[PDB]
Amino acid sequence: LYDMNGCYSRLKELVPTLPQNRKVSKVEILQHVIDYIRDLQLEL
Amino acid sequence: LYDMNGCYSRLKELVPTLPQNRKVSKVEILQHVIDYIRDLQLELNS
Structure with missing residues (x-):
């Protein structure tokens, strides 16, 4: 369980x-998360 | 695109x-997100 x-x-x-090297804001992380979930749902 | x-x-x-019937905190949302991404990746591996 995580903070x-x-x-x-x-x-x-x-x-x-x-990004592997670039600093990522929280909002940029969550935008990538949203697109990744939608991609996995479509591929499945 | 989103705030x-x-x-x-x-x-x-x-x-x-x-959960669909109660208030959820941000940390609870993110923990569910984590476990869902993991389940989708594991299904992709089969």
Whole structure:
């Protein structure tokens, strides 16, 4: 079970479309998360 | 495209394991999101 920062760290490790080197704001993380879930749902 | 509140609204719509009959906190939403992404990736591996 994760605090808010741990949740963001976990999402960064999970979502392969996020920048490898560039700093990511919370909102940019969540935008990538949204597009990734929608992509997985469509492919499945 | 979305502000922070819009992001949470969008995740409430996309994630089917979220509770549907009560208030949910941001951390609870993100924990559900994490586990859902993981389940989708595991299904992709089969």
